[PDB]
């Protein structure tokens, strides 16, 4: 029915100090299969 | 049922878009003869 208060967008949070440290882990173990000096980057799921 | 939907009561800026639609329609009550006129709220990802 009615919405009481304000119309705000639903969101999620992760800690930037924690999440970037975890991507620092998975970019090390990924170099074990693709060799060193390999510029690993991420992107945002092209379509679907 | 063919709904009838307006903007939710909100400060409509041109940059944002309406996330919640009003959608007042007709629906049968528990009696088979009468038809109440009820309203609801619906997300934009549920109405076309």
């Amino acid at each position, epitope marked *: 029915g009615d919405i009481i208060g304000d119309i*705000r967008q639903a969101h999620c949070n992760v800690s930037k100090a924690t999440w970037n440290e975890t991507l620092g882990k998975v970019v090390k173990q990924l170099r074990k299969h693709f060799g060193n000096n390999t510029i690993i980057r991420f992107a945002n799921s092209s379509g679907g | 049922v063919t709904l009838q939907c307006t903007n939710v009561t909100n400060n409509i800026t041109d940059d944002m878009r309406g996330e919640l639609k009003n959608c007042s329609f007709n629906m049968t009550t528990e009696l088979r003869d009468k038809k109440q006129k009820v309203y609801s709220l619906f997300y934009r990802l549920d109405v076309v």
Partner: antibody
Amino acid sequence: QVHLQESGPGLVKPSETLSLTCNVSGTLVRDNYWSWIRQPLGKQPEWIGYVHDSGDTNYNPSLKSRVHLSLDKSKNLVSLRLTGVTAADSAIYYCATTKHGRRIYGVVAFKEWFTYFYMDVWGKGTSVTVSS
Amino acid sequence: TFVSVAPGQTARITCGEESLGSRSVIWYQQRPGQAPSLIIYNNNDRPSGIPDRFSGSPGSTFGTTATLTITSVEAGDEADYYCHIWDSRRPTNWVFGEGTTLIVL
């Protein structure tokens, strides 16, 4: 010190390009949000609009077409202009200084706030009437 | 829109619609014959020069009305009060609210 000296024709003929200026005192026109307020006779006052250099020139959408606010940095002057005044705008006018301020109510990154306004000090005003 | 309170008591001025979203009211004071002034410039915060006896209502509630409470009413409060509400769902209010006069005995 802050105060606002004004002007005015007072008795104006209808369907005429009404104008009104408002002087300064110490502070310059370039460094304050400038707003204009009309108060009808014995009624609640009505915000005509608010003007500033660099973009902030948003008007009241009720009139929206016959109003034109403008600045004068050389004379250190603010100015109001009305085009084609009818017999309903017979009221008093006010030039005023206003301060802004944002009230966040949610995430600041999702544009979930607004910038309100409030007029701390006001001009003395003038009665600008239209009749025959 | 007339409230008659003899001095020494308190007064409550009610203006504006019901609280729809998160508000930020602006309260003014109109001297008779003169130009209006300012009392409250947020829900409760006030500028310097006025006393602490003026107060306001918080705008963090949904379903109330923008009140204006005055303790220790004196003879200088015989003026005209105007609310200027800024709700977060209705658009910009270019006219002020219901002007109530607070006449003191």
